[model samples]
Target: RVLDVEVYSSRSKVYVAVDGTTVLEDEAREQGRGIHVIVLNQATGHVMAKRVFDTYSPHEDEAMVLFLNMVAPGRVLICTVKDEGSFHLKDTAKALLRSLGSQAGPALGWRDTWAFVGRKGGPVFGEKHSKSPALSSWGDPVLLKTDVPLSSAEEAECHWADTELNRRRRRFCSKVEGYGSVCSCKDPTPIEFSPDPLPDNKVLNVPVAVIAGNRPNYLYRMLRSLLSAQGVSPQMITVFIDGYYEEPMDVVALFGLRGIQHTPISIKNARVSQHYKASLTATFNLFPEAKFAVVLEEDLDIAVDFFSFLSQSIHLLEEDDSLYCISAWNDQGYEHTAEDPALLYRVETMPGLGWVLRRSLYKEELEPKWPTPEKLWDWDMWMRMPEQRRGRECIIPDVSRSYHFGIKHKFNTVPGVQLRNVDSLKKEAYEVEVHRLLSEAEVLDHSKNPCEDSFLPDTEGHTYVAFIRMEKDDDFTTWTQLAKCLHIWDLDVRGNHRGLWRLFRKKNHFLVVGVPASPYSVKKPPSVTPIFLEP
Candidate 1:
């Protein structure tokens, strides 16, 4: 027997269903605006109680605080917001729901569609959160379905607020006190390191997590390449199969590696996100003692020195808090663009095709707020959000250590290349190169020729690079136009190396370094900025 629960939220209404039965739905609209909740008994999988706390009003926010505190432990909560539920919702209410493992509680903005399912004193089942794009339009309905069965091992304690009434809470004015916080902090200290090579034992000890799907052909080739690579340990590899299909599992068995299968969840692209979430969490969960893990998808082919590349730069993550993860793939590592494997760059965007992540980053930050299967978002894109990245950067090589052959994209690494003499590239030297590139790159002159030479059409066989100044938010509009003119994705700016934002015009790379006085402005500004329009 399995328990199933569904929660949906909209601008003016909400609903909760248990096992195909509608347990709660919006019946009256004029009563009040609040958070709707249905508490169920986990053992019997039946609705035990239902209540609406008017979180739009200050007093009702306090009422929900007490109501949640009175609920018994081990009960399941199905919660959703209706009619601007977050307008006056106090921090106490948010914290109370967060105690029940609700990741969306703290992020519930005005009129946001948020739905959450969680055990009162145990693990969170699922959550969906989305914000309205405009005042007239409601956000896309947030919905989720999750099994209700709980293991005894998943039980935990609740984090309730202090039993005090009329306590002052900082909801709106909280951020005002921390004004100029970024300016007050000192710049990140450049990591200091010796040029010694990381011991082979340390490199081999780092676990390898492989995520596979229906493509056993791809999985087999990926595994074979991984197993045959230098400094590999069979004992450290584990494959996570996305579906319950036996084909992928059979390949894993043939390789003599451990395999895990996740039941398929229906929804376009949801299964992919689910697999990534399961595989990543499982890697850290299974190997609690491991400090870091390398994640490889089924479709990627590793370079001869993949492990060597990772091992050489892995220590940079531990030494630099500003660094998020180390990526083995580069978006612009095309045949002409990439050459020296020993050269690495700090990038703001995450090249997640094959990457190394620390256990601490997973446990402390990513795991708690991982997107629910129903969110319908790519896992990598979700991870790239400003909230998750938090002004941090990633380390990537000039010549990618991993190649993505799953599909044809703009960039691809040339064959027969490997990271050589990685030990000689010390951290001190890496920092100097990063600074040097930002300072000395050629400044783009858009007036030369808008089509042929303005965006830096290929001049020679070598990689061509130029710098443009981005000083303020308005400058991003100009950048977006340039991206559109280049026929690339016109999404928000990405991949910042030091103060430079990396982009590509054809085969050439463009660095968008900042002018003086901007947040990402460098100490030594570029001599000139690109001219976008006629004067």
Candidate 2:
């Protein structure tokens, strides 16, 4: 039971065998190249079908030759050059098999059939030729050696060789050559084939933690905004709230309606004064479930398209390994004249309005130790230490359309006797003098004094009183100097009145009076002298 075939350069050869009896052979060379594709039946040594490749490049033609050979009905002989730069093909084939999770090699008997690649870069076989051994003739069998039970070395080696043989066969079938290769030829032109393009729309499933606090009005507003967001949905939202106030019932109910999973932590040990750091730590705890967590304060009012802005921004920042946090809020305007808009800026270490933090940054890189628990008046602790200690803090551009006005000042009188009239010309002059003194002193000078001579006390019980008149249009910009004055009170207030009063007594001696407009003031009935103290 033997089948013999041959092919010549000028004539095409086709062989067909059926039921081990019917045999057909045809020749055609009209396409300028001989075609020889062989198919065989394993039960009976008979050729089943045959075809050939007709092209300039034998390797290019070999692809079709290999395909036909594999689909044949019998054991096939796949030959390759021993070391003819086919490592690229071999490697690619092996990768393809690995990706498919299939064993590699030949000689692993297939229920259907086997296909082989003959050594030539063409599709041909001689009509009369010696039988080529099967693909197993090339590689040694692979076997597993186990200590539990003893097995003969010959048996193990054979087993191992068989395994290796299968691996090679799998590789040959799946390997794709020249798919990603570039032409190194000097006059290479683009190939005329439609390459598969990646899918235009891809959705990424990223785990995110959302942190919020009291102020249900703001919380609900943000939740509604997020729910209506184009790319973000409720299922992706995780909420963390401060424990001081009762849970926001309405907000929670709304989240329920949206099918968003909500997780709440009663943030204990959180003070209104230290709310930023305390809330941050609480939010930090939720990062374990997600690769990154988005910390959103209750007061943040997001733009309608905030999620889209964040989605695009996060994707860009995630590629950079050094960036730890992505800030959505920046005080600087959009158009930056600086060379790099992403360059680090010296900003106060206050809690950013909203930010995305990578899980590794929080869990692996950031210092595990807690920040100082002391009641520090400044909000710069978070930024100052992290930026100075760990290089620059990465801040993303401001894309949020909202701002925070979280704190409001309350008007309360400083309890005391009716000091000099707040509207008096002398008192106004005194305040102007204090303002001049502050303006003249340098911020860096610790020992600079900012008090007027006439306001300086000469008696033990006497104290210098001042009034801060806040206009309706005044913002922090207008009152920053006043805040700085209060910050430097120990130096400016105590040092200037050193001999006049003790520190504690002087603190108690000073008075602040807010005056009303004359139109709002009640007319005093004619009296010897009218004195009023409003507290």
Candidate 3:
């Protein structure tokens, strides 16, 4: 529900309030000229459902695709999605991604799905029809792959074909003719369309693994947030307690004593990293049949869309061949600098807060590297190793679904690290609707499969790859995802000045070298990249 819209000052900016109490004020690229005026006042959802086709918005037709670039209310309504196969997707011949325990042959291709809304541009399928399906004011984005297919390789390239192959052939060559005959042009002219209806079955639940140590404050909040999450009917909560079979009885009772399994480790010395690894590993072992597992640590607080965001990231795991994990936590999210909360980008550095991993990934990758205190690199830091990460990327959100409650600072030092002066994680999650990739409808019944109009490779996510380009000064970055995952950072490239030289992507990336630091400097550059990391 859009609670209010007000034009303030003469600056190029916007103030939008959704769910009433939550207000988003941001700098708009375009300026408002006349005395601040709201041309009309209408329920945002009402307009979305009743006359979405007629609504090419910014709430203003002259607003030039605002949400496509706006941050505030732009992502006000968003959710994570699960992928249903599409012919355009490339697939590995593998049956199931991994074995489904004692009862399976067909291995399911699993992935995470993030949704896109706002301006979708392309040349105007959309022939003029009776009562236009979308805003008649905007051109209907025409389909380009409209060029039809041929019947097996077009016979033989004979003498006639030779002329068709020549510059003169550019005239009659069906190949040339077919090529020049279509358009996939881009225009800023706005549009909104009635999308196709969704399928009958949309999976309603995702499996969850809540790993808790002794912090009842954190655990209590975690369960509450999970229960309040929209669009998720979590299949089951298989709680795993670490540091040897401990339990927060009061917390469990409140969550009504859900099944809790203690890890097969004893809590003699309480090494946090080992405790965590044991806890996470135990959960995977306990539920070998589950496809995806989200590891929620006790110290994090989540928004209502936390599950929705993870669900969105989940599909990415399936389709993005290079993506191995989806992090629901973004250290940079608190500032909200991203234009859209929905934008996702790749990062080599692991952002471990409230992250998700696949069943096979655990069996294959994680179980082996489960860190020990003796080995002692932060678990997240350990995963950064060139050997550990292999060649995989982690997809993450613009605004984190998971927030560190900053508890240690206050919330009773949730095990692991001790605390000093900490403040409460003052947060009240604003509402966002959960839905499938379905039509223009803003809210989808959780049970329905979310369908949508067509989507593209570029539509997925946006943002930057935060590494410095050392060797090549000419190389720049782009938002294309497939191209993004190809890069790699050295396993050691954290705070170590030596870590910078560890970067790699298609031969070599932004940084090809760096020297150690008691500190850092610019005048001196350093080394052969392969020395630290193996070929």
Candidate 4:
């Protein structure tokens, strides 16, 4: 005789029917939260035991193991997931299911819809059954209806439990140790992604390394934003977690990404720097062919054009030795200071929230002298020191490509309307535009104490240009006074564009040009606007 079996599962409900008998369904026992199982005596085509295991509790997984082990050799087991069973579904239980001819069991994840029907001694019932949807709120119902082979009367063992409707109330007080002869955990393996065979050729395909910590909320939002950005693929990104976090691993698994976890370190700063070092090294090693790698952290969110911005401007790294890196951030990129997406600058300081660097630079200079965990110095500050930069600068955008939520406030269709393809622009044409802004623009007179000029907030955007005299080292003191008087951060080693410092005042754009011995300097003065004037 063939036994009739049916199983249904969704996020809201799970149902099981055997020979037209409703053994388990939602609300019957209020049973839509964890693992549900029904044992059947194949010889009589009747239910033997129906039990639910709320596996979120640590020991519930052990009880399921005991329950499954008690089933006789020839009987059939029907399994279905209610709301979530995989969050605490141990490897021991997954392997136990695999031994009984279940494929999706081992691959189950949080909130995934899964159902299984298999006999005790490796007898098959139906095809591999599982569905892990991108959004777990609602998924395609996991349904399976098939005829299972009946056990002979002599071989049937139906009295494994006292009642046909019994609970796995017998809890294992002691935690199951070492997976104990059922199955052993596979060693943590390094993930290597092969280049996408069919990649979008228009996009510059650089591998992105994500540095993550214990913050699952931050990590999830960051990953979602990155994946949604233009020119990003799952294969191009690798997540490196600083320590073991069960929840983050589940989230990473949800995205189907390759992730690496390191041993936990106690000191916060040391841990962060170590994670960065490990992630960067791991990314380069994983993609030996990758000329450049982009580093993104867990706390930041990216713009829609983050990848596109990188794709177009990455060439500046190789073409210009004076440029140490290409940064996707502008520290002074406040609401008024940033408007044009295509506009870029050469900055003396390293803006590292999100940036790209070359493999050769990392291997030759950084990796050898990278601060060890014992040395508690911040890695970014260490890299910013003159010894490492050696007078080289980085390129940043007028409108930053990355976003940090902690900041109070924050184009490339055309020159000012959208992001511009920097590579496509001819140098003569580009230089011609620079000459017009630098030479022709009126220079502000510092003799008048220009900060005294007042400004009214204006809706219309303006670019105020001025050149500062830098004949002596003490010239910065004069610049700092102007910066302080204008209510702007006055650090000399901050963001700049070809020796031009871009600052903001009263919703107006200010460009204080530093020159005489600087890149893109003119012999004469380009007048500067020291304060915001009414539009």
Candidate 5:
């Protein structure tokens, strides 16, 4: 047998009674606010029960009613503000229950209820087993008071349920702690720490090729500086001279005083044209034998120990293959920091001046095709080579001395600048600090210094020799006048297919035939006569 219960609300208060005992009560706020729970003996009242809660929004109130009904299986009735000022509790209650049974009732697993209430006043009791005559069949019952406070018995019922909820929450936390998932102890150590250092004692050999022209005085001074470089000289040094005049040969004779050897290739028309192909061809001829090469023009006055810095950088990047080139010139507008001496970047191209190149890869990928006289082109090809080659390039942040391209221009000025004279270009001891810094930066490698490889720093002055001859009229310049005269070729075609095109196309070479014994041998000597000019 089932028990019957009815819960409803008056305008002023909510009330709940179970087994004829007032179980819960609370004061209502406004006109349409209340909660009620009713109970009846199933043997006497057709085994039906209903509970009602009237709040501002029916959805909220209905949810509360449903929760309570779940606690004690019974019918739920809910009323909300929908009609005029008049209170029609019974009518609203019936409509809410009917709508809920069709809509939310399925989701909450409620099929039907034994008793129901509506907002519009109706009989207080159902058809059979009716109690008093007036109360059983009344259509409308007048309410005397709209406000009712919670009773003592109702408070007791809710307090007992609240105690049970608190107990359950405590149990849940205690179970989580027992599983060792909670942080109950203080942390023993801090979160921050230092990183490990990089590997040590790693060495690398960087090959550098310094390309120079007819400036023998400047070349001599550069050699002096390189010899006194802090750590190591360059592994290999290749000097390409545009054999425009006999100056290269004379310069080579004087170079013996500095103790260096220069391989000069005398191209027929080198001095005749201003094309950059001569340098490109020279690079192709030399760089294949070395790991990497630093290309510097004749006018570049490097830091005292530039070789040391370059060698160390090459060693650092040996493991990192992605870095293809490193430039001594910092074109990017970033201020240099002491900690990081270089900035790594992936750029489209780099200037040809003072830059390192990976020999094997660069030769395989970007070797320039030297065209003959029929298909001769401009020198802009060298500047655009980096774009055609796909790889990463970076600019190292270091201040190195360099002279500009034009003659006596204000833009090519350097600190403590001097002309191409012996007194001005003499090595100074004051540059020792600069040399120290360059050495520390690893630009100088002790093993493969350029001074050592080139046989520079000769104690007793020996006759150093280089061959320079001009193929074209424009190749003869004021700078070429100082060196000794070697051989002259005034021919349209001299030797093989190579000589024929190089002559007509105005490409010259410098051939260093070693040091001669006598000054007479160093003077004008016409060994090979040209086809164009007769003796």
Candidate 6:
């Protein structure tokens, strides 16, 4: 007789028991364990009776023999599948409670029992132990997938491994000693993240491009910083101007760009970097022969020792094929705690404030495959693509060399706290602890950091950038600047500011109109006239 022994895709389900016996096989010993056995009736289908058999020999009689043990004269065994619901976590669960006084803990709840088969006088090895080395479901079932990405992998390997979500996966996968995979890796003895010893490296000697718009002050600071950057010679530098900026260009003339490409994306009187993506794409495509390219934005200010560190670390990037990016900024992720200024670590994050990328990543991986929707959009946020982070890991300095002066955010205020951390970076560490290793945890610590940011780290988070809207076609700030400014916020007014926002552009001067974060946030009626902020 055929009975429905429902195994609903690792979800919770009840298996009814009316007859004296019900025959069952969980993958028939292929997935992990025992062959021939009767799982308890009224039992949960969620638990895969993945019993590791002691011996290979098994027949019709052997299967029936295992079932007979559970079928005593007076009582019946009722095992209920667990509620696949999360939070059912180790919380008040018991099994086989009333009829048979068996099992410890709450046996009534999900009993994901694990069985090991060990033979007498012979060796079985550790193979039958679910996962041989107890590889995490994420780490075990996947590919590096230059061909495929997180989709092809069994689970996103280590994507959220240390999280409770991964804890839930442990039950589904047999990585833990059998229960609580969280315990197995919670305090994982993280391997060190330090890079290999420096090879007394040769110069990066590559084309350097800076994307600049109309910020003369910022551009001036950037040019001055590069004057002393170790690997950079003034004549070899190239600057891509997004719009017509005679002043910034005047400043740029002093440094004399190796090649000045004034690639403007304006239609008529529109001033915008909506052309940023295409411009940058063509820029990378322009330098077809360059094996690697060092990129920067106009607003970024680099450290005195920036290029020296880049010279040493790019060697690590060259030696390691998995690496495709190098960054000079730390996210100020560990402001309270002390960290090595020159400590080099890896991350899944696309630390875009200032970075370097390989030609393969640009040309082979990204150039052709970049999403159509993203071509005229934001560059930095798109870097968060899982595919980008999956096949690659980028190196980030322990302390930042480059910093974001663009504090105007159209949406979120960038996920980093730039304490300016002058004290944190200490004294521009000239070199790093190359030989000492660091754990992946240490390397990705910045990745774990929340979107913690402050424009004025000390002055109650002020906005140095502005929220200017396009008043007309010929307005100083076009949709391009507005679109770009979505990533940069100005007048970061925090307190009474958190309210309905209306942006106004008066020629070059702009104003941020708002009430309050909420009605409850205010003590009295707000002004009838909207608050006016000047450009």
lDDT by candidate, in order shown: 0.66, 0.34, 0.36, 0.67, 0.33, 0.39
Which of the predicted structures, 1 or 4, would earn the higher TM-score when compared with the native? Answer: 4
By TM-score rank, best first, the candidates go: 4, 1, 3, 6, 2, 5
Q: Can you write out model 5's per-residue Cα lDDT over 396-445, one digit (the tens) per residue?
A: 43233233332421111122222122121112321242233223321112
RMSD of 3: 28.5
TM-score, every prediction:
0.54, 0.32, 0.39, 0.56, 0.31, 0.38
User: lDDT of candidate 4?
Assistant: 0.67
* lDDT for position 122 in model 3: 16
Better of 5 and 6 by lDDT: 6
Q: Score candidate 2 by lDDT.
A: 0.34
Q: What tens-digit string does per-residue lDDT give for candidate 1 at 1-535?
A: 5678888887767889888998888846786467898877665665655788877777888877776765555667788887778878878877877778887787788778888888877688898989888877677887788887843422322222322210111110111111111112133111111222324545667889998888765886788677756557777889988778765676675556789998877567777888877888888788878889998998988766677667666777878777888888766555544445556677777879889888888889998998887888888888888899887778888667777878523232333234454433344555665556555555555446443444565543233334344556446545455545544445665445544555444444455544442434553435545434222
Return the top candidate by TM-score: 4
The candidate with the higher lDDT, 4 or 6, is 4
Candidate 1 matches the true fold with a TM-score of 0.54
* Superposed Cα deviation of residue 517, candidate 6 (Å): 36
Per-residue lDDT tens digits of candidate 2, residues 252-296? 443452112233322333243244444445445533355666666
Per-residue lDDT of 282 in model 1: 86
User: Comparing candidate 2 with candidate 6, which one achieves the higher lDDT?
Assistant: 6
Candidate 6 per-residue lDDT over residues 1-535, each given as its tens digit: 2222222111222222223222332332233221222222112222223222212223422332343332322111222222221113222212212113323213212223211111111121111101123222211211110110111133212334565444444332322112222223334321211222223434444667787777665776677666545445554467767666565665565344543545565453232334444545655666666677778887877665566667766666666666658877544222322134544555545666667877777777776655554244345556666665554656666556776676411111222223232222211221121111111001112121112332112332122222222233233322233223333232322111112121212111111212232221222223222222233
Off by over 4 Å in 5: 1-207, 232-235, 257-289, 332-347, 368-387, 398-535
Q: Per-residue lDDT of 1-535 in model 4, one digit per residue for the tens?
A: 7767889877778888877777888845454577788777667666656678887557788899887875655657788887778878899988898898888877777777778888878786863345565643544678888888776775652223432111111111011111121111122111222322323333355788888887765776787767766657778889999889765655566456788998856477877888888888999999988888898887788766776677667766777767788887887776645666667766677889889978888988999988888878888998999899887778788777777753233522221124464642233444465666556544545446456554322434555566565544334654666565555555654665455676555545566766663455553544532222221
In angstroms, give how far residue 65 of model 5 lies from its true place: 99
Instruction: Judge candidate 1 against the unseen true structure and give its global Cα lDDT, from 0 to 1.
Output: 0.66
How many clashes show up per model?
1, 31, 24, 15, 68, 29
